Design a protein around this ligand. Structure first.
Ligand code: VDN
Ligand code: MG
Ligand code: ZN
Length: 313
């Protein structure tokens, strides 16, 4: 197609030029083409392209297939969300020096998981066990796109490497289920508090990869004020939109969190979210690698901003 040809023939700027290494990155002013280019640069600079012999044309087709399976009409959970979640992964890996800690297969899987973790989201969200139903669909959608002809970027992996990487991908995507985060963090935080966290440990690695997946998933809560505010409105819009649709299809009144009225509470809500969900995660990630401090730092600054508003409100 015309779009595939343009992407495959375009020049991919450097990571430094695309500024995808900084945790303060923002996609707002980038076109759809520029994001895909950034995506390519990510697979490139993590050495996934050559270490796994990826055919440039196939990588481009896959990236387009993944971006396609996201619905733009969905306020927040769309391609830009997936792209940013992946960009945070890259930054954490590079700027956050998390790369030397993982294997190429783990990295390969994480990048892929990051890009496809919310595939075909329909704007139906939760509150806080639901058995990761939503996440399961996101994986099927991911698996499918990896099997579709000319989209098989995992060709070149031995049978075992494929079976391995697939498991890691499945787990990373499902990990993005907040219910699972709430379930597993307790153990993670305790290992970090007792200064006995060990990545050399299979299970503690699986736990780390899960925690890392969630940190990137929520990266927006750590971004610079302009950006955070801008994305919180996408999030708010999705929720309110859901409350309306739900009161329509069903006869159920929206929770304050999801009904348009009572929007004056987003500041108050934002503080609670950060306190109960984000902060601990980013403070813990910083314990695993101080180079991730930027995330924790920005999460904090965001709380100050939201706290002020919640009162001044
Ligand atoms: C996909 C939903 C999760 C998510 N991702 C992001 C980036 C965001 C974000 O900025 N904000 C929210 C977000 C989260 C909650 S909450 O349900 O977690 N909240 C309920 C009440 N309790 C107090 C007892 C505190 C916690 C409430 C409002 C929210 O956002 C309004 C924009 N959720 N969110
Ligand atoms: Mg999800
Ligand atoms: Zn997500």
């Amino acid at each position: 197609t015309r779009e595939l040809q343009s992407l495959a023939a375009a020049v991919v700027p450097s990571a430094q030029t695309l500024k995808i290494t900084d945790f303060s990155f923002s996609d707002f002013e980038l076109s759809d083409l520029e994001t895909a280019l950034c995506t390519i640069r990510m697979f490139t600079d993590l050495n996934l392209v050559q270490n796994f012999q990826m055919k440039h044309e196939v990588l481009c087709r896959w990236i387009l297939s993944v971006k396609k399976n996201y619905r733009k009409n969905v306020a927040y959970h769309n391609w830009r969300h997936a792209f940013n979640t992946a960009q945070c992964m890259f930054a954490a890996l590079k700027a956050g020096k998390i790369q030397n800690k993982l294997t190429d297969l783990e990295i390969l899987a994480l990048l892929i998981a990051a890009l496809s973790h919310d595939l075909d989201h329909r704007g139906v969200n939760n509150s806080y066990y639901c058995h990761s139903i939503m996440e399961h669909h996101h994986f099927d959608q991911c698996l499918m796109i990896l099997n579709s002809p000319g989209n098989q970027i995992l060709s070149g992996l031995s049978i075992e490497e494929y079976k391995t990487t697939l498991k890691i991908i499945k787990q990373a995507i499902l990990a993005t289920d907040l219910a699972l985060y709430i379930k597993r963090r307790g153990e993670f935080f305790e290992l970090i508090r007792k200064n006995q966290f060990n990545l050399e440990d299979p299970h503690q690695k699986e736990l780390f990869l899960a925690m890392l997946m969630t940190a990137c998933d929520l990266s927006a809560i750590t971004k610079p004020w302009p950006i955070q505010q801008r994305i919180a409105e996408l999030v708010a819009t999705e929720f309110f939109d859901q409350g309306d649709r739900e009161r329509k299809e069903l006869n159920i009144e929206p929770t304050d969190l999801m009904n348009r009225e009572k929007k004056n509470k987003i500041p108050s809500m934002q503080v609670g979210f950060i306190d109960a969900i984000c902060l601990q995660l980013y403070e813990a990630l910083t314990h695993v690698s101080e180079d991730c401090f930027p995330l924790l730092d920005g999460c904090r600054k965001n709380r100050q901003k939201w706290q002020a508003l919640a009162e001044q409100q």
